[PDB]
Design a binder for this molecule. Sequence first.
Ligand SMILES: [Cl-]
Ligand SMILES: [Mg+2]
Ligand SMILES: [Mg+2]
Ligand SMILES: [Mg+2]
Ligand SMILES: [Mg+2]
Lengths: 231, 204, 196, 243, 244, 250, 241, 195, 222
Amino acid sequence: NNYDGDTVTFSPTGRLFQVEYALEAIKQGSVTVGLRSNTHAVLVALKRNADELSSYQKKIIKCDEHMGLSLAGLAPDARVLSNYLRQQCNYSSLVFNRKLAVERAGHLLCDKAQKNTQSYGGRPYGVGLLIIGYDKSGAHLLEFQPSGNVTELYGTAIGARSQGAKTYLERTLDTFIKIDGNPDELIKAGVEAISQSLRDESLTVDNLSIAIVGKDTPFTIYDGEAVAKYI
Amino acid sequence: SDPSSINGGIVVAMTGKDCVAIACDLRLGSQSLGVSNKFEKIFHYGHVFLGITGLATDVTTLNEMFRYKTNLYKLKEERAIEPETFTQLVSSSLYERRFGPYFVGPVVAGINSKSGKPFIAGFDLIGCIDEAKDFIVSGTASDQLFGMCESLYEPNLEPEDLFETISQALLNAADRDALSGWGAVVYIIKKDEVVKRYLKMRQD
Amino acid sequence: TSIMAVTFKDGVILGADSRTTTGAYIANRVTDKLTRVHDKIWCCRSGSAADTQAIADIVQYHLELYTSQYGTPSTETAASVFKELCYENKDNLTAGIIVAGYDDKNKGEVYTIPLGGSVHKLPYAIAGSGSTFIYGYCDKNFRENMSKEETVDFIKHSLSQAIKWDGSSGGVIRMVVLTAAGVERLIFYPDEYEQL
Amino acid sequence: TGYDLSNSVFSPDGRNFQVEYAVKAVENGTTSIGIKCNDGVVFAVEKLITSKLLVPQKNVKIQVVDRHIGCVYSGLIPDGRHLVNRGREEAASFKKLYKTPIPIPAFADRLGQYVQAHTLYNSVRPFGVSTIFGGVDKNGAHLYMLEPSGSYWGYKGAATGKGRQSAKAELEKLVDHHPEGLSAREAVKQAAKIIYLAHEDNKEKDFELEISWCSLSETNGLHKFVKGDLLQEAIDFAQKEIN
Amino acid sequence: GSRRYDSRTTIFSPEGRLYQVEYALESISHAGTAIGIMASDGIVLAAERKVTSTLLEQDTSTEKLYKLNDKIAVAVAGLTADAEILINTARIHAQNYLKTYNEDIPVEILVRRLSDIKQGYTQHGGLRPFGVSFIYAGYDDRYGYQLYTSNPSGNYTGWKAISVGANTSAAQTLLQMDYKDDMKVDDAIELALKTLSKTTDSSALTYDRLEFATIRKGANDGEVYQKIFKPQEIKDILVKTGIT
Amino acid sequence: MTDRYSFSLTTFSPSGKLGQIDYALTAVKQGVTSLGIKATNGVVIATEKKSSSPLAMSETLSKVSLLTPDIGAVYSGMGPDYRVLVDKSRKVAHTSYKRIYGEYPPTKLLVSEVAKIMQEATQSGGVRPFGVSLLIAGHDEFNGFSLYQVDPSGSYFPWKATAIGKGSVAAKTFLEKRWNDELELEDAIHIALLTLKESVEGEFNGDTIELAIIGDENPDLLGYTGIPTDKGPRFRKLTSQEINDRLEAL
Amino acid sequence: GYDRHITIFSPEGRLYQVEYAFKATNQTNINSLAVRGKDCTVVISQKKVPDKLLDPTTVSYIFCISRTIGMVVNGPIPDARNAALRAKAEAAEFRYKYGYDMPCDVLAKRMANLSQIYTQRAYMRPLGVILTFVSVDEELGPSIYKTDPAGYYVGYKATATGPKQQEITTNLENHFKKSKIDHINEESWEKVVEFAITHMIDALGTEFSKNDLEVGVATKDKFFTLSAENIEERLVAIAEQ
Amino acid sequence: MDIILGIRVQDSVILASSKAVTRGISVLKDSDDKTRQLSPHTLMSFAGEAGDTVQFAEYIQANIQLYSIREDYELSPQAVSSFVRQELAKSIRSRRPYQVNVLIGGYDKKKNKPELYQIDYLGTKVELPYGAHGYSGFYTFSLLDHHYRPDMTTEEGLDLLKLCVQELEKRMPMDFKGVIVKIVDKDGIRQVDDF
Amino acid sequence: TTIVGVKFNNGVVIAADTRSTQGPIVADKNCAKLHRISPKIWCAGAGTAADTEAVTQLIGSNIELHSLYTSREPRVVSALQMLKQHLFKYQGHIGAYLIVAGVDPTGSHLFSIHAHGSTDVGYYLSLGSGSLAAMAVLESHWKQDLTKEEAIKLASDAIQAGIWNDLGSASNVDVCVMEIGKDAEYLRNYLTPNVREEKQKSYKFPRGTTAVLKESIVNICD
Ligand SMILES: [Cl-]
Ligand SMILES: [Mg+2]
Ligand SMILES: [Mg+2]
Ligand SMILES: [Mg+2]
Ligand SMILES: [Mg+2]
């Protein structure tokens, strides 16, 4: 109200409204789902078009051979944060001959987002990210909020109507965690999860975007006829 | 190569009874080549006179610099700068280029307008003040000038006697220096009249 | 220069000559090379006098500020601050410093910091141009847990020889005793130590 | 009015309302505690299980500084991480220059001055965390708690977050009933109980217990997380006391 | 943060005016009147000191008329402290030019330089403008005798006769009435003092309330002389022109 | 952090007023009275030592300050602002003059430098004006004795005699009646003490009054002998006893 | 009304932020007192540990700035420690640059100048503290110099700070009106501490245990704080006469 | 570059500058114009280090042209020469100094007088009746000292200049491939196309 | 140059010769080499003349400002610390070698300071090209607890050793005595040679001897 003019101002109840408004941009964004087993981790994203002449906005970005994310909210902010992750993954490989741990990648993203919430002049990032990866401790899934809060999860969803997919994953938890050594079935579970968030529209060939990373699987993105198999 | 002896030239200043004198040769050269016989090395800012020997570009530069500074001094102070004060300004200005100095040998001469006391002073290229009662010498024939001045000088000379003494000191010193000569000027300075005389000398 | 620091039962003792030379001229024959950086942390200086004085003054400043915030520093901490200055500015320094101090927890300790800026904790240390001549003597005569009087004798005899052979060393022998009891200064004149 | 719109502005009371509003964010956070024992310290924190999808034991909250200091906080988690990052830089520069690991009181002031600096200007926001931290140094065990204002003191026991009143009352009983002191292993057990008791203020969702400790005898003065059998033993002790 | 307290000194109004410049001009309208009159054989600068005291040391006092160099002088209307900042900068500029070219700075070049400095404070930096209007009286060998004025906007113009400060509307009308092109310095001296005498807010115009200056080629042949009038000399010229 | 106040805090209001300068002058008006009188052979500056508490040692608080050996200053308004201005004035006398010309600045030029500092606090970013008016008395070879007032705006004026602060209006009227161009230094001190008594409520003695003069050279205060041209400072602060002696002849 | 938010003049020529910083000074509800002996300077301050969970040994508003200088603070602890750290840094730098120990009055002036800057520069707020510096200066002897948020400072024969400063001030005033000297005419610092505690008891009308007080003592070449047991010995001597 | 001469006669200034450009072993050009017009009545010839000569000359030219436009006025030769001297005096204490020697020949329209200024790379300025740079003066000054008169016509100045060039062509070891001669007077600058 | 410093029971004395040379040529026969840092802190220097003077004035300037700020009389250890830290920063490129002597509320002091920034303490010190001639005299006669009279004599005798035996040292002896609790007394030309040279001739020329081409009045007035 009087306390939402900038990110440097607490409200009387201890809230940061600019951060909360940045969080709101994610809710307007298109739905994206993340889930993993013990061998693989999968991203599924519903891409959004402007109209029938337009392309469908890409949602998934590769950060390294073993790591990548999906976005919901301001796409340019995702480009900034994913670029930063690419650099940090790269620094780890060049300097330490070491693949960057997914948990450490989450810590780095948290700290980068935090600096934009405590200083004058800046603004919070207006995007949420779902980071998947496979490192020395197996498969991982992270959820990033531009408040700075990063959380490691078995599965999750962000964007508009993400609550439907999140409840589904909460029911299916015991099933999809056991899908080891079967990439297609894990993706199926993700496609079924994201279907719980659809209304009026359905998953078409240029609508759907899928990514996967695992034990002997580099981070690869599937679009176009490559996802027709899962429709 | 030695910056202080590329162009050549000399300045000498003396004190007398209620007067001071300052004199210089007129030569500017490029080592062996004589370039100009009209290169005067004495300048004045109000009633304070400054002779400068050494590298000619710095001589010109410092004259312009002290004209600059004495003009601002006058505008702010609402009075002309005195010899004692100017001497400190020259020292200050030279030392601020301690590790990239002007290759010069300045000499100040004048009479304090309030006390009437005759004043002279000399400097090395980085501002060390030489504050001698009798005479100050500078240039490529400074050794010759020291010899002439030490023997010819006596205290409390009248203006017209001081003119002869300083003129002969300069002339005969310059005639024993390859890089000095080609004409000479002598300033005789009293509290409220200054006479400037060009001397006749050999032109080799 | 001839300097040394020796740990013993009750603490540590620093010793030094008093000669400072400019070529063959003795610019100062009564120099004090035993410098205080804290109440019971002293140092022996060798190398450039300008550099070692500048370093010691900075260290004394650092330990004064340390003490105001965190209380009495350890001898190890003092040595670290010395090392940090000597190591990081090794290109522009010529300093060989021995650090000696007394804690109640750690007792007498000696650290030597040679030219490169390395640190070496030792039972005793010798340095300076005159030290070269007493490596053999000091190695043969040093014992651990000596008494105060034995340690004074050991240093007196050692620096006596260093002075005897090194022209850059001479004058008086100064010593500083660091124990729980406090800080004691000692001085020994030529007529005493030359006849040893 | 308008005094509460900008940080570092004194109200007519002499108060910094922006700092007081930061405290509200702390009071909104989960419960975290600290217990000073005979030869060390114990830290414990309540981790709310928002969903079944949270991977157990993965979202670690307690943070180590150097190798001998533990830090836990309640409020805005990112702010707490920022403070610990600074603390790690402070500890590194201290050890670099002085060789010895940073003493706990020394470390406390480094955090204190940094947090206080964020109450001096309107171009920065105060920290939305209260931090409980400590460890073992050459003078023994130390426990501290640091507020958004930059204010900190040494503690026998400390608590912050939503269930701080409950926790404090429990801590006060331990201080009264043990003037001679508490053992490290006892403190771990007691820490588990207190978090379980303080969870009544957050009773809607279930939680995960996380404990760490630094002890001269038990961990050689190094900060370690309580894991496996010792953690389960503390959980059992805690569950027995609430029933 | 800090934005809250920013007055934004360098913005246009909806009408396309610079607020701070306009308000600075309002300030200047309360300053003592300064007048410049250009004649064929010289320039006159006349200015009124603001309500003085009997204990003010007038002979060592300077609030209106300042020397920039031997050829150029200024009359000030507005904040004296602001004016001295600009005056010192102008003095340095004149000396820079003299050192560079070994010639005295032409009047307009000095005026343009100061006016550009004023302009800068209205377009960038977020600082308040200088609350000063200058009348420049100067001579160079290109245009001869010249009068200029500059104001806080950084705009400058040339004049045959001009006033700044208080009652400029009344003063300018009086000057426009009696000024002629073939006028001489002694006539211009009289016009300046007569105009001040009529426009002044004081009861009577006396020597202790005035600062006066002339720039004349009435310097012994081919040269120019600046004359900052002394208190007694202002008293004499007041009697000569028949005002006291 | 960083100072993000890069804009002026003093600006013109629609009426042409610079509010912060006017308000600074208001703070000066509330300040304790101080005055200055110029004689033929000296200058005197004086003020009241308004002690905030009787437990306070008012001798440790110097309202009258030496700037150079021949220049002194007194103020009315905010004491802390004065103290820092004295520090800056002392330094600028060296950096912008003595280190260049080898001599101390004339009174008018040191005043000019102090005035410049005060002007800048009126236009520079993120600062308020100084809440003081200064009275600076001094001597130099070519200008003789002088007395200057410097206001928060940076404006300065030379005076024969003047007063600033609390009872300045009454004090200036008192000085107008007594001042003439034939006053000797002792006469000016006498008039100063008379004038100052009117604005003082409580105790009026050498311990509650601070008074200094710019007069003859004091070779006894130089600290060394041997150089004829160096004859000592002209600034001298009167002692408590010296003031009380002249209060009997009051 | 933004003239009340930052340090610019109000229409009355006042700085409200400075005035409000003075009010923050009494937020701790603690009173302090300082007096001078022949050879020493004593400072006492109330100690209140309202929480049983606190480590009472860490609760302190007296600081050892240098070997010779002590400082007691009236105000919140964050601002107190800010001022303490700076004073320590300034004292250490002074010794390094000028080759002798920073005098108590000079440090006070330096901290007062820093405070003055906060009252003139908008981006910096005043510290809500009053700083009382004490020492036995090698030139001036026993010294008390106090600084406030306005950037004001002055030397004192004795002084008091806190919510009930007036009661203590008047009590001290009355004593020095009797004795007609600028100090406590006593040889030992122990008895000067006893004087300080006695007169605080009289002025406040409250009794003190060993844990209710905090004492700092400055002698030649060192400032030190008393332990609870040292204070207890002081309280016993007061009660026994 | 090599030979640059200058002579100030009654009503004009004449600048003669060699045409050759030699890069070590070969003569790359034999028609090089070592001069720039700074203003309608001011001409500057130059010689020194390769690259620096033309860079400096064109830099001066631009600055004077800029001044001419801003003020709608042509600076006097004296003013132009003082500007150039300051630039060279500034340059000598730079990281990498301009190694350029110049002659400035101008006609002052105010005074109705020709003027010749000689300035070396150090910033050493002198006004002369005739001048040169490098070794050119060593061969030519004895002839100029003998024949020069301040009341010479332009035609007489050109004849004396021919004698100077002839002596250079006889006793100088290097082939400088003749000279381009330009005259600066009240009507401006013109080139003598047959020399 | 010959400069000495001698401590005595209640103060310190500094002394110097008065020859100032440009190489082997003498420029000033009566140079005052004794300088002030503060009223009761004096110094004299050898090495680069402009550097000794410049560094003395700079530290003297700061010492004055420091004394004003602290309301205390300036200490010799302060001049010493400010000097050495300045000189050290410039790694001996400022060729300042000084003997610093003075009294302050702390006592009487005598230090030597070298261009690279090293300092020394002593009861007697010498400096300059005559340093060894002087030190030979000081090592022959210095004793503990000298009177002011004995210390002035030793100092000026040490300068004389340099004057006679060192070519770069000559002419007169300047002395400054800094006694505790007193004003420092500076004794310019404390020793001069008696007797004065008289030349065999007078070289004063007949008027009109010099040939002249022009005369003119120079306008020095505005
Ligand atoms: Cl300060
Ligand atoms: Mg010759
Ligand atoms: Mg010849
Ligand atoms: Mg030997
Ligand atoms: Mg402020």
